[PDB]
């Protein structure tokens, strides 16, 4: 009875690099405001 | 400097959680 709608998900290396950069730069930006 | 000491944990989870999410998705990609 397995579900026919399951799909595999992907994230390529370039997307990891872009995504990590986004997170790190957001952290470097907002961290000053979090410490205040 | 009299900073907000909840800022360390907010900054740390802000980085860790979404970064872990990306890493998990990327690695399971490279192994299929």
């Amino acid at each position: 009875e397995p579900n026919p709608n399951r799909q595999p998900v992907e994230l390529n290396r370039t997307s990891l690099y872009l995504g990590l950069l986004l997170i790190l730069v957001l952290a470097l930006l907002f961290s000053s405001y979090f410490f205040n | 400097m009299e900073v907000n000491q909840l800022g360390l944990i907010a900054t740390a989870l802000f980085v860790l959680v979404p970064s872990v999410f990306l890493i998990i998705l990327y690695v399971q990609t490279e192994s299929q």
Binding site: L20, L21, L28 | -
Partner: peptide, 30 residues
């Protein structure tokens, strides 16, 4: 603690730069 934190994040970005250049997905001509 706040100084350490800013420097840590900056340091991670510099390491990201290194991998994104030297350990990129190489472009090929499909």
């Amino acid at each position: 603690m706040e100084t350490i934190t800013y420097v840590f994040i900056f340091a991670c970005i510099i390491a990201l730069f290194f991998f994104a250049i030297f350990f990129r997905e190489p472009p090929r001509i499909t």
